[PDB]
Design a protein around this ligand. Structure first.
Ligand SMILES: [Mg+2]
Ligand SMILES: [Mg+2]
Ligand SMILES: [Mg+2]
Ligand SMILES: [Mg+2]
Ligand SMILES: [Mg+2]
Ligand SMILES: [Mg+2]
Ligand SMILES: [Mg+2]
Ligand SMILES: [Mg+2]
Ligand SMILES: [Mg+2]
Ligand SMILES: [Mg+2]
Ligand SMILES: [Mg+2]
Ligand SMILES: [Mg+2]
Ligand SMILES: [Mg+2]
Ligand SMILES: [Mg+2]
Ligand SMILES: [Mg+2]
Ligand SMILES: [Mg+2]
Ligand SMILES: [Mg+2]
Ligand SMILES: [Mg+2]
Ligand SMILES: [Mg+2]
Ligand SMILES: [Mg+2]
Ligand SMILES: [Mg+2]
Ligand SMILES: [Mg+2]
Ligand SMILES: [Mg+2]
Ligand SMILES: [Mg+2]
Ligand SMILES: [Mg+2]
Ligand SMILES: [Mg+2]
Ligand SMILES: [Mg+2]
Ligand SMILES: [Mg+2]
Ligand SMILES: [Mg+2]
Ligand SMILES: [Mg+2]
Ligand SMILES: [Mg+2]
Ligand SMILES: [Mg+2]
Ligand SMILES: [Mg+2]
Ligand SMILES: [Mg+2]
Ligand SMILES: [Mg+2]
Ligand SMILES: [Mg+2]
Ligand SMILES: [Zn+2]
Lengths: 24, 98, 78, 127, 60, 206
RNA sequence: CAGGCCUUGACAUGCUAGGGAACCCGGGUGAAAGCCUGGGGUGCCCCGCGAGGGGAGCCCUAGCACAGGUGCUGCAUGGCCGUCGUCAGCUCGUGCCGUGAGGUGUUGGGUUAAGUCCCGCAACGAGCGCAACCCCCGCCGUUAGUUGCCAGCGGUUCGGCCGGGCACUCUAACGGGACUGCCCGCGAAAGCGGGAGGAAGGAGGGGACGACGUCUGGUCAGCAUGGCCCUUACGGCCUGGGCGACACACGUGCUACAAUGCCCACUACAAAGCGAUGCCACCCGGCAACGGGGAGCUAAUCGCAAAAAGGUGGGCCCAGUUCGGAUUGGGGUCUGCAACCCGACCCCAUGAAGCCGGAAUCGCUAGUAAUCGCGGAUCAGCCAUGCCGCGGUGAAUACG
């Protein structure tokens, strides 16, 4: 859910990028 | 070749001051590209009417920054006299390049 | 969190290092609850400020990578 | 030769072109049924041709830009009509009767201050 | 203590961190702008007079 | 409390910016502050003239500083030795080559910003307020006009109970844009408090 | 708030006095503030070979007059904002009735969103409101073309990239359009219901606009301001603490309790804004946050940038689970002098309550509700799930 940092959504919602949502 | 910018605020003036720089840019030789109206950048900002606590019914304004472009094809020594010395911008601003 | 420095204020070590001279007494006050604990600074009980007074806090290896602040309670009724 | 109609519908501008022939349909550089794969509303944009009856006749070449895929399908459904309405002074009998002409003025409205969503008003305590 | 502040704010010698804003007209620290240099209160005020160039009662 | 500011309202059309020029985000807060401290000084040492506006224009280093007034007698000076010292002042802070135009008032009884000040004065001078209004109003019609409305705040007459004085004649379509209504506000610093005055001069229609 | 310090003061104005007078570089003690102290010597007005002597700004000391106070009073006030409510209302001039307070007008008949209009009438008119005058989305058009397009023929290293073109699209500036002028039905009128043409009717749909007054409404802490009160402190600086406390109650919120679902790889369609020690392409380092290099941009011509939901196929299998991410441990990064109180991200490990919520109660009539992603202000950083905006997908129902 929009509340799990270790998730695509979570990361997205948080407005961040990372290992679960890298910059391409 | 020479490019010219036209910012300012009241699009009522800027339009004229610009348009002038064509009816007078053709008489000085080379042809020109009609006053081209590029997009407008806007400055909107909201404020809470009351001077205290009333997050509702507040009020926001705008600050329309009109821009306008136009350009002469060939740089005549003729035109130069006009442009360079015909500085008549009430509240206008102009940038020139190549 | 500091990985290139240690932000540990100088008027500390300064007063700790000069004290390092053969190692004498210890009673030493400060308001740097914001600095870090330096290794070997054990035995040097440093009364820390909290806004009210200076807590006569001992200091030992167990506690090091910490701030003298963690050791000072800011509020009351813990 | 070229048969164009201005496709526009809710922040969606579609460019419609009609070339007699097969029936192939293109949009922004792709096969119609491919650029809209999944959308069961795709086959809806071509519905105008299906009542003029004249489908196996115009290799339509479109290019819609701006908006949402579905919105685009709307822009298109208007171009395919506005385009062919031109090259058929009699095909007016459908763009007016079979309601195929309206920009749908229907569009998102400004979010008023003090209304989470331009209308949805915040909660309420009272107590 | 709002006088000594406006001045204290002007001075800057200490750590750029503490360099903070404050309304130009009224000694107000809250809701200022990186543009105008006015506070919501002030801004809207001038705004209504016209002393704010190109600024217009927004409409869309 | 509501009612918009007939100025900022009309702003767009009818009434134009009391300060008109341009500048980018880099420097704009500056040319405003300036434009402000300018008017700031002018409203001070020049009041004895009763100025009802201070347009200001620019371009680059140049400054309009145009001052409208009703009694220029004190603007220029004796033969011309007053304004001369003012250009100095305006420059004494403005590191620019500021000019300084000036005009008059074809009738102060049609210059709200004045009707106000005039009234604002009377009160401050213990005059009777009802009259000072019922009167200051007529004075605006007698001198040709279509709209005049004056308003005074509370404390009228040192009354511990702050009231409010209303008074107007003719028509005043405050909501109508094709109105061209001059709006003016003046203070009053009576030993027993403070007063406020609203001036509404509905002039030419359309 | 505790503690360490300063007094014509952190700032305005004026005056008196020997010195020195502009300014720049330090040192000592200290937590900082502060206090104490050691070093070059000056364009100016001018008698004058010169030394030197008088001296106008500005500054330092001393003293005098004064500053300053978010201290009290929003029932002493200005200003501005909130509310009844954009509700259809409130009044005025004169005439007339009435002992008078006050009526009439503005009661009545039809109509309307409307004190909108009409017709009536001891009333005849009028003003502030209503409407209209203003901006936006709409239809179409003219001017203008470095956005745009095999649109047309074109060369093209195979991208509107190059030549080249205003036709599209678009950008932005000026216009036409819609006015109950047509037809039928009802009527004394105003005007109601029906219908065609039209992009749009009978105010076309949203903005801006909120009467006399009301709540002794709100705010003296934005500002202004009368009165009151403080002056080596009710003023001023500083370091540290606090506003972030927590057995608890409420308000508004966010994430959820799952297969109309969640996860993972791939692949699309936006709008609106924003950017100079600023947004970062593109590289190399790292699992990553981010870091070393470094192109372009004064920004319809580079960047923020990726829209997300969607579409494809792949994995879970009804389990407190691959549902849900609280809690905490360990390892890090960035802004900043400085993250103990007290920042935001990252990664590993922890995986809490929750399987749809009592009594109650809220929002919403259509591009609305619901749902998904995006921009901006403030701003070093950020506790923003807030607010103010943008667009994508896109309903249910209205007997009464
Ligand atoms: Mg999960
Ligand atoms: Mg939406
Ligand atoms: Mg509320
Ligand atoms: Mg204090
Ligand atoms: Mg800060
Ligand atoms: Mg007295
Ligand atoms: Mg002093
Ligand atoms: Mg008040
Ligand atoms: Mg009281
Ligand atoms: Mg009467
Ligand atoms: Mg009588
Ligand atoms: Mg009467
Ligand atoms: Mg009326
Ligand atoms: Mg009839
Ligand atoms: Mg309208
Ligand atoms: Mg009260
Ligand atoms: Mg005050
Ligand atoms: Mg502190
Ligand atoms: Mg704190
Ligand atoms: Mg708080
Ligand atoms: Mg806390
Ligand atoms: Mg794409
Ligand atoms: Mg945006
Ligand atoms: Mg943009
Ligand atoms: Mg590479
Ligand atoms: Mg770098
Ligand atoms: Mg770099
Ligand atoms: Mg966690
Ligand atoms: Mg439920
Ligand atoms: Mg139940
Ligand atoms: Mg019940
Ligand atoms: Mg509704
Ligand atoms: Mg956001
Ligand atoms: Mg920020
Ligand atoms: Mg937090
Ligand atoms: Mg919030
Ligand atoms: Zn302010």
């Amino acid at each position: 859910g929009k509340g799990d940092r270790r998730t695509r959504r979570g990361k997205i919602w948080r407005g961040t990028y990372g290992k679960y949502r890298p910059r391409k | 070749k020479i490019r010219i910018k036209l910012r300012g605020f009241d699009h009522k003036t800027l339009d004229a001051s610009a348009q002038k720089i064509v009816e007078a840019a053709r008489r000085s030789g080379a042809q020109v590209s009609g006053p081209i109206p590029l997009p407008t950048r806007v400055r909107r900002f909201t404020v809470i009417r009351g001077p205290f606590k009333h997050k509702d019914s507040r009020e926001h304004f705008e600050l329309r920054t009109h821009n306008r472009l136009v350009d002469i094809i060939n740089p005549n020594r003729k035109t130069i006299e006009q442009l360079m010395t015909l500085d008549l911008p009430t509240g206008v601003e102009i940038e020139i390049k190549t | 969190s500091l990985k290139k420095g240690v932000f540990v204020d100088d008027h500390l070590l300064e007063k700790v290092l000069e004290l390092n001279a053969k190692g004498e007494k210890r009673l030493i006050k400060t308001w740097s609850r914001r600095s870090t604990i330096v290794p070997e600074m054990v035995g040097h009980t440093i009364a820390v400020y909290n806004g009210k007074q200076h807590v006569p806090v001992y200091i030992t290896e167990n506690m090091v990578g910490h701030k003298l602040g963690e050791f000072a309670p800011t509020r009351t009724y813990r | 030769e070229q048969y164009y109609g201005t496709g526009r519908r809710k922040e969606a501008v579609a460019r419609v072109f009609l070339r007699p022939g097969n029936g192939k349909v293109t949009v922004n550089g792709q096969d119609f049924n491919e650029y809209f794969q999944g959308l069961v509303r795709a086959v809806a944009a071509l519905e105008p041709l299906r009542a003029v009856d004249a489908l196996g006749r115009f290799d339509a070449y479109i290019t819609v830009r701006g908006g949402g895929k579905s919105g685009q399908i709307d822009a298109i459904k208007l171009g395919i009509a506005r385009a062919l309405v031109q090259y058929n002074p009699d095909y007016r009998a459908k763009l007016k009767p079979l309601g195929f002409l309206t920009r749908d003025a229907r569009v998102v409205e400004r979010k008023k201050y003090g209304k989470h969503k331009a209308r949805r008003a915040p909660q309420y305590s009272k107590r | 203590a709002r006088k000594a502040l406006i001045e204290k704010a002007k001075r800057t010698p200490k750590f750029k961190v503490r360099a903070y804003t404050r309304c130009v007209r009224c000694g107000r620290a809250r809701s200022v702008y990186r543009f105008f240099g006015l506070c919501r209160i002030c801004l809207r005020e001038l705004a209504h007079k016209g002393q704010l160039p190109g600024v217009r009662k927004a409409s869309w | 409390g509501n009612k918009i500011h007939p100025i900022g309202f009309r702003l767009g059309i009818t009434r134009d910016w009391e300060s008109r020029w341009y500048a980018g985000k880099k420097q704009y807060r500056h040319l405003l502050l300036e434009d402000q401290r300018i008017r700031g000084l002018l409203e001070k040492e020049l009041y004895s003239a009763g100025l009802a506006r201070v347009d200001i224009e620019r371009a680059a280093d140049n400054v309009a500083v145009t001052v409208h007034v009703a009694k220029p007698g004190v603007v220029i000076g004796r033969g011309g030795e007053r304004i001369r010292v003012l250009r100095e002042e305006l420059a004494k802070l403005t590191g620019k080559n500021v000019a300084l135009n000036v005009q008059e008032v074809q009738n102060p009884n049609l210059s709200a910003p004045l009707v106000a000040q005039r009234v604002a004065e009377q009160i401050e001078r213990r005059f009777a307020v009802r009259r000072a209004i019922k009167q200051a109003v007529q004075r605006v019609m007698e001198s040709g006009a279509k709209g005049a409305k004056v308003i005074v705040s509370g404390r009228i007459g040192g009354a511990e109970q702050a009231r409010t004085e209303w008074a107007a004649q003719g028509r005043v379509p405050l909501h109508t844009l094709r109105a061209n209504i001059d709006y003016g506000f003046a203070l009053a610093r009576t030993t027993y408090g403070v007063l406020g005055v609203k001036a509404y001069i509905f002039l030419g229609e359309v």
